Amino acid sequence: DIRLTQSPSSLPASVGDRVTITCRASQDIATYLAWYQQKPGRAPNLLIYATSTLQSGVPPRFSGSRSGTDFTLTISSLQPEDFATYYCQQLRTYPITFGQGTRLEIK
Amino acid sequence: TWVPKPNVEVWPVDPPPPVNFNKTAEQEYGDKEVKLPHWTPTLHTFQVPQNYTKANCTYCNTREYTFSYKGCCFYFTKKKHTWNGCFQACAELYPCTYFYGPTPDILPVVTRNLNAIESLWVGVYRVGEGNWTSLDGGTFKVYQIFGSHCTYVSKFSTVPVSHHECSFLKPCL
Amino acid sequence: PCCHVTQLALENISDIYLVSNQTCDGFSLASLNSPNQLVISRCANGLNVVSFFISILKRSSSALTGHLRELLTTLETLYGSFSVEDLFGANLNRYAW
Amino acid sequence: LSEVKLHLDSHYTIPWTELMAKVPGLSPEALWREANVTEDLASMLNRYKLIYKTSGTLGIALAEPVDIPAVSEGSMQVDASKVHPGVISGLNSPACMLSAPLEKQLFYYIGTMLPNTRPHSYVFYQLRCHLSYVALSINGDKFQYTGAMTSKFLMGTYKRVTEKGDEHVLSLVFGKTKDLPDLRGPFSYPSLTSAQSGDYSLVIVTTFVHYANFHNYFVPNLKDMFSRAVTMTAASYARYVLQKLVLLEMKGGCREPELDTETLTTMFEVSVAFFKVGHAVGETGNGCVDLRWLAKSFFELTVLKDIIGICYGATVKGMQSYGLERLAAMLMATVKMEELGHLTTEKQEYALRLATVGYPKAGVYSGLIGGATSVLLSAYNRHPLFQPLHTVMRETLFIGSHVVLRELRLNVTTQGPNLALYQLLSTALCSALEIGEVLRGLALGTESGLFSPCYLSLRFDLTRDKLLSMAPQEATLDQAAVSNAVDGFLGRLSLEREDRDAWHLPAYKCVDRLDKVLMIIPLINVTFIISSDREVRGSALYEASTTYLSSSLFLSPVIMNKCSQGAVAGEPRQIPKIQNFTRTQKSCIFCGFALLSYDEKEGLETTTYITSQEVQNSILSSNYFDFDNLHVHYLLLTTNGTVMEIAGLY
Amino acid sequence: QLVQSGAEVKKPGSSVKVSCRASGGTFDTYAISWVRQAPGHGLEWMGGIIPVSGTANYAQKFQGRVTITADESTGTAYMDLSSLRSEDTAVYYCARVPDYGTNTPFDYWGQ
């Protein structure tokens, strides 16, 4: 039923700047959102998670907040060392269930 | 005749009342230097259980689902409820929104047979002071912040949690 | 001596040290040393302490002396010199404040 | 309560044992317990990330006007708390008021500025200082606003309460960047301001969830509002906000409120409009303020208070000085209201503003109606006939009419004849050209639609069809806004609402049909009621020689305002006609009559109250008596109680 | 506080990097789900729907697998492919499902 859709990105986002990717589709009702980032050939790491009314806390400074219909995530750093595929996830509390791909090449 | 007449002049008025150069600063003003910003609190309605209540005795066997008059804790898909019409329980002597109220042991049985009914409304409420006691007491444990007087469970949920909104279309089993 | 994790009214404290980010381990921490005679050396927070001192000085500016004026100006642009939107180090767990 | 030897790298000592006496009210102990210097840095990063941060501080390099005039001539100093009967002479004596006692009077009530709520506890400290607020509530307390001010900065709060008891809070602190409140923790102003001029800033304080909730329906224009606040003067601002609120009052705007951008902005303006005058008085710094500027600003503030109280239910605390009111009352008491018409326009406006300021309450003194009526009578005497009001005279009448409206909205009044004379003069001033000009102004939103000598007129025959039949002939306006202008005019002229009826007028109980009257003409010793139905009680009855396919246009001359026991039955009389009329009349005749012109089919067209020989000369000399068209008849309603028609001149 | 996991039973493959897991830090929440990711996809779930503790528990959404042991302190989640057949040979990760600061290691492979 509930699906997540992200906007494909192809620009290298220069070197020093912020990024903002929207993940949203249909209308969520009782499912929170979580962010996962994985470098090519590595285990994904849990980023901040937004329940549409509050954001979780991770030592990395990746402030990601959602809106009444969409979700957004900011890193404030687009170095090539952070050229990794980000993922948005659908979960009630525990069980991440649905995700959609993206692309965040940095150079 | 057309006798000449005088012009039109305004009617006379009385002298203004005298003003007093004797009122004190406190007397003229609010009579108190210390104040506090004005707040205008309001009030909101509550949840009250009326009419439908627990039936008398029972005529069931055990935990099972049937589309008939047999079955302890099970019912068909209402498909039209918002936790207010769900409390009506338009069925043949339903002791709750379901046939039986939620329990901390019955939950796995209904969770197992929950294929694509992810969201459903459990007949458990509050009275604005906590201590959730739907129709049998016992203060059923429930952890939640978002939500006031609605409850729902899913496959990945064991302890009942509150739905942040009540007007949402929550099917009842 | 940078402190990582350690967890007092103004009556029982009589000394306080402040250090720059370079002097510390990339942080801005203070040690409210109570009046050897040093009973405690609890690692306070530089940001909150300097903000409280700045607010006190700004509120008391009605009768501030020359030395206190230059002290306030020094604490200014020292708060801004830190400009710590984020800082890494001393990773641990916590429950609440 | 002890001394701390601060060490950093030099050495500093803070003597709290003596700093307490110098600065009363300081609480160093509580502020430390608020600071919580023993906090894990993870808690800092958690709390700091909660608050919404806005970047892009644009809209810079604005223009700062001059508002307070310099001290001129030999005006003395008037203490705001030492007003005495012997201070000055009159309107021709320049005077100035001190700024420190005036500021003390304006900001007299103390209280807690920054509350202890969650959004304001993370960022700011606890504040307690002299303040004033403009609070209001709509939608049954589902929406609240608090505009607490200070002589240095403003702070709004759009505290909205939804269901479940949860709230949503906003903040729009405005003021000089060097006088804004104190932050705490890792917070800094430049990461919060959304606009900044050379010396002003407009920060916003809220959490991300609250900001999104308010962003659902309320989008701001902070650059535009900030530019308007900085660029305009206090009086001009106040006038602009008052004009917008008055325009919103019609068309059923303040009857019920809506949650959109315009309403909340207007609330913020109103707050800024008060704060601008407060700061301008405060910014003088122990100098002096010219009396004319003070009178203008406080008159605008009083009118703004009246309109916000009328259509919003708002409550205003502070922002009023009793010394200025005493001075205004003393100054106005010297002059005579009945001689206000023989004065210069600037002096007339100054006296009217002083009278309005000195007596804000309604019913305390009703003698200002005489002065307003005299001013209106002089303006009408010197006004060319059947022409739209000039802008200067229009603004003078707008200044004057506040007292008349305030007395009109009462329940029992004493100034009967003066009110009747004022309403008759207003009726004589509402011609076709004036109505067209007001319609054009309402359509274009300029100052023409703000006020007109028609809202207080006794002309009840202005329907939507009649008004639409006389749209302005200037490119047909926008050709679609004419309907909106007509709707606004009808709303301002609603009989049931607006408290514009003839309860105060004697001989009004003898009509029995309030919706069938056309106009009422309250002459001296006799009042005429014009209606299309016979069911009216009066001393006599007169039927005009109108066409069959039109209204009857009856005339009932109630003599001495003594209504009759019943309607005069039988066949109504017929108006006599005078065949001979020499249009020279050197002697002052008709000085008290009221000539009326009506159309056989269209109906009532124009009215002219003859008050002096100049009016009679203008009436006779001009082409008013056009007998070529056999559809216009002129009725000379004599004060004797009989109606005489004019057939033709030589 | 630390959990080890990883196992596989089937006929094919070599299963390079077949045993690895880790945990620690942040806030601990029960259950340990298992995610199976094919190349070119984001994430699909095997039987990790209902785990009991840090050592996981058996589950089944649309597939047949197995899980053993349940302990939220040390445990051993392990896994057992149901006699792996053509395709379905791809990297499968695991999570500690700790909500706040959830841990996710890299393990398993194909061919």
Q: Any residues with CB less than 8 A from the CB of B40 and at least 6 apart, and which?
A: D135, D137, D141, D144
Whether B8 is covered by a domain: the verdict is no
Q: D580 vs D593, D598, D633, D646, D649, CA distance in Å?
A: 19, 21, 16, 9, 6
Whether B82 is covered by a domain: the verdict is yes
Distance CA D102, CA E77 (A): 78
Domain CATH number, residue B83: 3.10.100.10
Taking the CB of residue D424, how many other CB atoms lie within 10 A of it? 25
In terms of C-beta density within 10 A (0-12 exposed, 13-18 middle, 19 or more buried), how is residue C1 classed? exposed
For residue D643, is it left (φ>0), alpha (ψ between -120 and 50) or beta? Answer: beta
- List the alpha helices (DSSP H) in C9-45: none
One-letter identity of residue D236: S
CB pairs under 8 A between C and E: 4
In terms of C-beta density within 10 A (0-12 exposed, 13-18 middle, 19 or more buried), how is residue E62 classed? exposed
Q: Any residues with CB less than 8 A from the CB of D524 and at least 6 apart, and which?
A: D592, D639
CATH number of E1-111, picked from 3.50.50.60, 2.40.180.10, 2.60.40.10, 1.10.3720.10:
2.60.40.10
Q: Any residues with CB less than 8 A from the CB of C51 and at least 6 apart, and which?
A: C79, D35, D182, D183, D184, D185
Distance CA D236, CA D228 (A): 11
Taking an 8 Å cut-off on Cβ atoms, the answer to whether A67 and D49 are in contact is: no
C96 interfaces chain E, CB cutoff of 8 Å: no
- Give the technique used to solve this structure: cryo-EM
Q: Any residues with CB less than 8 A from the CB of E48 and at least 6 apart, and which?
A: E32, E33, E34, E35, E56, E59, E67, E94, E95
Taking an 8 Å cut-off on Cβ atoms, the answer to whether D212 and A68 are in contact is: yes
- Residues of chain A found within 8 Å of residue C85, distances taken between Cβ atoms: 61
Say whether domain A1-107 belongs to CATH 2.60.40.10.
Answer: yes
| Residue burial E7-42, b: 16+ Cβ < 10 Å; e: rest | bbeeeeeebeeeeebbbeebebbbbbbbbbbeeeeb
| Residue burial B115-127, b: 16+ Cβ < 10 Å; e: rest | eeebbbbbbbbbe
Tokens linked to D595: 């000539």
Distance CA D295, CA D327 (A): 11
Domain boundary assignment for chain C: 10-80
Report the residue from D8, D37, D45 with minimal CB separation from C86: D45
* CA of B166 vs chain A CAs: smallest distance (Å): 12
- Residues of chain B found within 8 Å of residue D404, distances taken between Cβ atoms: none
Taking an 8 Å cut-off on Cβ atoms, the answer to whether D3 and C14 are in contact is: yes
Q: Helix or strand or coil: residue D226?
A: helix
In 3D space, the residue among C50, C86, C90 whose CA is nearest the CA of residue C71 turns out to be C50
Taking an 8 Å cut-off on Cβ atoms, the answer to whether A68 and D209 are in contact is: no
Nearest-Cα residue of chain E relative to residue B111? E50
Taking an 8 Å cut-off on Cβ atoms, the answer to whether C91 and A61 are in contact is: no
The C-alpha R_g of chain D, in whole angstroms, comes to 31
Domain boundary assignment for chain A: 1-107
Nearest-Cα residue of chain C relative to residue A62? C86
Strand order in the sheet with D517-522: D517-522, D526-531, D554-559, D542-543, D573-574
Find which of A47, A49, A67 to mutate to test the D interface (most D CBs within 10 Å of its CB). Answer: A67
- Residues of chain E found within 8 Å of residue C91, distances taken between Cβ atoms: 25
| Count of positions (residues) in chain D | 650
Distance CA C29, CA D39 (A): 11
Report the residue from B119, B156, B168 with minimal CB separation from A95: B156
B171 lies in which domain range? Answer: 55-173
CB C22 within 8 A of CB C42: no
DSSP H/E element including D28? helix D28-35
User: Where does D248-395 show beta strands of DSSP type E?
Assistant: 288-290, 315-317
DSSP H/E element including C16? strand C15-18
Taking an 8 Å cut-off on Cβ atoms, the answer to whether A29 and B119 are in contact is: yes
In 3D space, the residue among D379, D367, D458, D365 whose CA is nearest the CA of residue D418 turns out to be D367
Distance CA D522, CA C78 (A): 78
The dihedrals phi and psi of B103, each to the nearest 5 degrees, come to -140, 155
CB D345 within 8 A of CB D396: yes
D29 interfaces chain C, CB cutoff of 8 Å: yes
CB D605 within 8 A of CB D427: no
Taking an 8 Å cut-off on Cβ atoms, the answer to whether A43 and E106 are in contact is: yes
A95 interfaces chain B, CB cutoff of 8 Å: yes
Give the residue carrying structure tokens 């980032």: A37
Q: Regarding the domain with residue range C10-80, which homologous superfamily does it belong to in the CATH classification?
A: Viral glycoprotein L (3.10.390.20)
B155 interfaces chain E, CB cutoff of 8 Å: yes
The rounded Cα D599 to chain-centroid distance in angstroms is 37
Taking an 8 Å cut-off on Cβ atoms, the answer to whether C16 and D42 are in contact is: no
User: Which domains, from first to last, does chain D contain?
Assistant: 1-320 (3.90.380.20), 321-650 (no CATH)
Taking an 8 Å cut-off on Cβ atoms, the answer to whether B4 and D588 are in contact is: yes
One-letter identity of residue D380: Y
* CA of C39 vs chain D CAs: smallest distance (Å): 16
| DSSP-based helix, strand, coil % in chain B, nearest 5 | 10, 5, 90
Report the residue from A63, A67, A68 with minimal CB separation from D49: A63
What torsion do the CA atoms of B152, B158, B159, B165 make, to the nearest 10 degrees? Answer: -20
The dihedrals phi and psi of E12, each to the nearest 5 degrees, come to -90, 180
DSSP H/E element including B160? none
The dihedrals phi and psi of D41, each to the nearest 5 degrees, come to -65, -30
Distance CA B19, CA D324 (A): 13
**Which is it for strands D643-646 and D577-578: parallel, antiparallel or unpaired?**
parallel
In 3D space, the residue among B164, D600, D6, D258 whose CA is nearest the CA of residue A32 turns out to be B164
CB D528 within 8 A of CB D555: yes
In 3D space, the residue among D163, D120, D84 whose CA is nearest the CA of residue B44 turns out to be D163
* CA of C7 vs chain A CAs: smallest distance (Å): 21
- Residues of chain D found within 8 Å of residue C95, distances taken between Cβ atoms: none
One-letter identity of residue D329: A
Whether B86 is covered by a domain: the verdict is yes
- Residues of chain A found within 8 Å of residue E27, distances taken between Cβ atoms: none
Whether B36 is covered by a domain: the verdict is no
Taking an 8 Å cut-off on Cβ atoms, the answer to whether D2 and C11 are in contact is: yes
Nearest-Cα residue of chain E relative to residue B158? E50
Chain breaks in chain B (C to N over 2.5 A) after: none
Instruction: Tell me the longest C-alpha to C-alpha distance in chain A.
Output: 38
Domain boundary assignment for chain E: 1-111
* CA of A32 vs chain D CAs: smallest distance (Å): 15
CB pairs under 8 A between B and E: 4
Nearest-Cα residue of chain E relative to residue A46? E102
CB D44 within 8 A of CB D136: no
| DSSP-based helix, strand, coil % in chain C, nearest 5 | 35, 10, 55
Q: Helix or strand or coil: residue D110?
A: strand
- Residues of chain A found within 8 Å of residue D49, distances taken between Cβ atoms: 55, 63
In terms of C-beta density within 10 A (0-12 exposed, 13-18 middle, 19 or more buried), how is residue A1 classed? exposed
| Residue burial C10-35, b: 16+ Cβ < 10 Å; e: rest | beebebbbbbebeebeebbbbbbbee
- Residues of chain B found within 8 Å of residue E49, distances taken between Cβ atoms: 155-156
Resolution limit in angstroms?
3.2
* CA of C3 vs chain E CAs: smallest distance (Å): 20
Taking an 8 Å cut-off on Cβ atoms, the answer to whether D40 and C15 are in contact is: no
Chain breaks in chain E (C to N over 2.5 A) after: none
- Residues of chain A found within 8 Å of residue B118, distances taken between Cβ atoms: 1
Total domains, chain B: 1
Find which of B155, B156, B169 to mutate to test the A interface (most A CBs within 10 Å of its CB). Answer: B156
- List the alpha helices (DSSP H) in chain B: 25-28, 107-112
Q: C88 vs C24, D45, E23, CA distance in Å?
A: 12, 11, 21
A93 interfaces chain E, CB cutoff of 8 Å: yes
The dihedrals phi and psi of D549, each to the nearest 5 degrees, come to -85, 60
Find which of E34, E53, E99, E108 to mutate to test the A interface (most A CBs within 10 Å of its CB). Answer: E99
C11 interfaces chain A, CB cutoff of 8 Å: no
CB D396 within 8 A of CB D344: no
